[PDB]
């Protein structure tokens, strides 16, 4: 399991490694981007493995490691969303919005 401190240290390491890679490739570290990181890592570590995921990768720790839940209530205990106790706050919020849009109208190649 990946504790948040581990992810924080990974983020710091990625930032320092990004500045190192920009130093190596002669580019300005400030404007150095993820496309630039991909190009530089493809040049420095050439790999013709057919699997694009078996090739060397230098990604942000957020992207490469999985994600976790979000906090749904603060220290006072009150949930942030008014539809929290449904257990499907996002879905029912979306349905509520759609129904309101339909009510407003009633008053008035792709998949």
């Amino acid at each position: 399991t990946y504790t948040e401190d581990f992810i924080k240290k990974q983020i710091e390491e990625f930032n320092i490694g990004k500045r190192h890679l920009a130093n190596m490739m002669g580019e300005d570290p400030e404007t150095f981007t993820q496309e630039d990181i991909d190009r530089a890592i493809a040049y420095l570590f050439p790999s013709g493995l057919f699997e694009k995921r078996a090739r060397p990768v230098m990604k942000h720790p957020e992207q490469i490691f999985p994600r976790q839940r979000a906090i749904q209530w603060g220290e006072d205990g009150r949930p942030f969303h008014y539809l929290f106790y449904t257990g499907k706050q996002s879905y029912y919020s979306l349905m509520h919005d759609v129904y309101g849009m339909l009510l407003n109208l009633e008053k008035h190649g792709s998949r």
Binding site: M95, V98, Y99, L102
Partner: protein, 86 residues
């Protein structure tokens, strides 16, 4: 035997439609219960069995009428959803 003939259970044919007249006669004999009487009289039905059969038929008719009334009463709600989404 002692009654006048060709009045009871008699049907006239219209424009030579013999089959329609015969089927109307069958309808009349069935609706008046005569067909059921004739079929039931072939063998003797015991009084207890007769009583049980009549009780069962009466109760079945009552129950079916009540169920039909219930479904006809609750069919009013069967329409397009007026609060779709919510």
């Amino acid at each position: 035997a002692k009654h006048l003939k060709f009045i009871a259970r008699t049907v006239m044919v219209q424009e030579g439609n013999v089959e329609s007249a015969y089927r109307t006669l069958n309808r009349i004999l069935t609706m008046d219960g005569l067909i059921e009487d004739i079929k039931h009289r072939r063998y003797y039905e015991k009084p207890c069995r007769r009583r049980q059969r009549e009780s069962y038929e009466r109760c079945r008719r009552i129950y079916n009428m009540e169920m039909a009334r219930k479904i006809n009463f609750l069919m009013r709600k069967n329409r397009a959803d007026p609060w779709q989404g919510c």
